[PDB]
Design a protein that fits this description.
Chains A, B: It comes from Streptomyces venezuelae. Chains A, B: This is Pikromycin polyketide synthase component PikAIV. The structure is a homodimer. Chain A is α/β, with parallel strands linked by helices. Helix content of chain A is 37%, strand content 14%. In chain A, strand 3, helix 3 and strand 4 form a beta-alpha-beta unit. The first copy, chain A, starts with a helix and ends with a helix. In chain A, 47% of the residues are buried. The interface between A and B is medium-sized, with 19 and 19 residues. The structure holds ligand A1AWE (2 copies).
Chain lengths: 277, 277
């Protein structure tokens, strides 16, 4: 495929995953942007991946697509089967990843506002519970806060699957080559250069200062196996979030928790949703 | 073509040529490199573009290819016709631009050493006079110093056609937009991403600290037209070199001095070579 992918493959080989994401972020600034939610390229209409039973007033689940350049409307396919006849599961796309190619968001708030609009239109009057994995976990929380402060509509809950927020990212740096190697392993087709630029841009968004904590209760789902070696004397390698409502540990590692062990994640979410309703 | 080209086009549209060259330099570090002159991809054999008359001991002219990503073995075609029946003119390629694609030089000295080997093999025992335009002007002098100090073979002269060395580059930054538009206008084909990366890497080499002046006499050739608008209170907009042996002004601007007015450049060179011989 493209040169950015080739360069990225080399950087992951050289254990410089982080340095090249910075290049991707810098480079992405020259892509055409949208500065208002109105100006967004894509239809962010959420895709219905599971239907719950027939009713009322039950929360619907919204999957917030992660940052991975190999990602897309297939992240939640395996997870969603476990919600069939249990909950509606809607997957909302991340602006900048579609198809010309898609405009990039001018800042993260403009992307969130475009998602907030499509989510409120699709969910109707049902309460919404936001779910995201890894980078998507961080996006799920920023979308939660945006819905609350800017659209006056806080979600009923947030599910954070293996989040590594700023200040708790030491494991994610020690294992960066495993993380970089994971992106290339997950390729169904080659990662496009446009999507790699989108990924770098969003990675930079999420490293920035985003004060503002959602009111919504948090289910923290954590992998149980480390992704790489780790001396326990360094402290905890696990995913972290401040003051969760509930913590669930599931089999697998950062990656496999969402593949081979997706049902374990779904079971933790379903038990948690009943508890808070 | 490729995404680096797409981004670069947007950058010159947005008048951010300089910022995007910095991106190209950063991305170029993730390209395959050669760390010793032996390991060089290309043959670098100079191409004979003009023949002088039959002799002995007259200098041959060596054209040092510039950094332009749209460049190649055609930079000196129009200029060289004016040396036919006057001087041998050899055009030596710049390492990193050929064909797989070509390895990038790990530093500038490795590229210069690879060129030094091919030039000495080609020039035989004739004295050598290096010629370069703009960025190539800077490369010719770094090559002159390299030939003298590293290969014990100082050239007989250097011809610097419109050089803007560090510390005298203010006019060429103000006109960076015209430089970028010139690159795209000059495209015989689309600039490949590999060559844009090479161009960025060489630009970075040539901004860095390179003390050390060649012993060889310098003919400084200067355009007479500004490339763009210019407030005279900013000073002299013209190309600069410290303590030139001879200064020649020719019609045209930074660009057209080598196109429509190449014969005036050649006439300045031919008189100069006779004086110093
Ligand atoms: C999930 O892994 O995100 C996909 C991009 S991987 C990147 C190194 C990463 C990993 C984690 C978080 C963010 C993030 N990122 O986009 O920078 O958070 C949680 O774990
Ligand atoms: C000649 O114009 O070189 C073509 C590439 S433009 C690049 C920014 C540049 C422009 C000039 C000089 C060097 C140079 N460079 O750093 O490569 O010098 C003269 O004008």
């Amino acid at each position: 495929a493209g040169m950015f992918r080739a360069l990225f493959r080399q950087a992951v080989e050289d254990d410089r995953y982080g340095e090249f994401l910075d290049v991707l972020a810098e480079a992405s600034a020259f892509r055409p942007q949208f500065a208002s939610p109105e100006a967004c390229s894509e239809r962010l209409d959420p895709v219905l991946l599971a239907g719950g039973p027939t009713d009322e007033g039950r929360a619907v689940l919204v999957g917030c697509t992660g940052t991975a350049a190999n990602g897309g409307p297939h992240e939640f396919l395996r997870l969603s089967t476990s919600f069939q006849e249990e909950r509606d599961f809607l997957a909302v796309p991340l602006p900048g990843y579609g198809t010309g190619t898609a405009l990039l968001p001018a800042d993260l708030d403009t992307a969130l506002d475009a998602q907030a609009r499509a989510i409120l239109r699709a969910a109707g009057d049902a309460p919404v519970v936001l779910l995201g994995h890894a980078g998507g976990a961080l996006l799920a929380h920023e979308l939660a806060f945006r819905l609350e402060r800017a659209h006056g509509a806080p979600p009923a809950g947030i599910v954070l699957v293996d989040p590594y927020p700023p200040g708790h990212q030491e494991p994610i740096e020690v294992w960066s080559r495993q993380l970089g190697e994971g992106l290339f392993a997950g390729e169904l087709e080659p990662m496009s250069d446009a999507r790699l630029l989108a990924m770098g841009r969003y990675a930079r968004f999420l490293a920035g200062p985003r004060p503002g904590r959602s009111s919504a209760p948090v289910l923290l789902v954590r992998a149980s196996e480390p992704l790489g070696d780790w001396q326990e004397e360094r402290g905890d390698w696990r995913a972290h979030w401040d003051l969760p409502h509930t913590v669930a540990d599931v089999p697998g590692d950062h990656f496999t928790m969402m593949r081979d062990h997706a049902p374990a994640v779904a079971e933790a979410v379903l038990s948690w949703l009943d508890a808070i309703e």
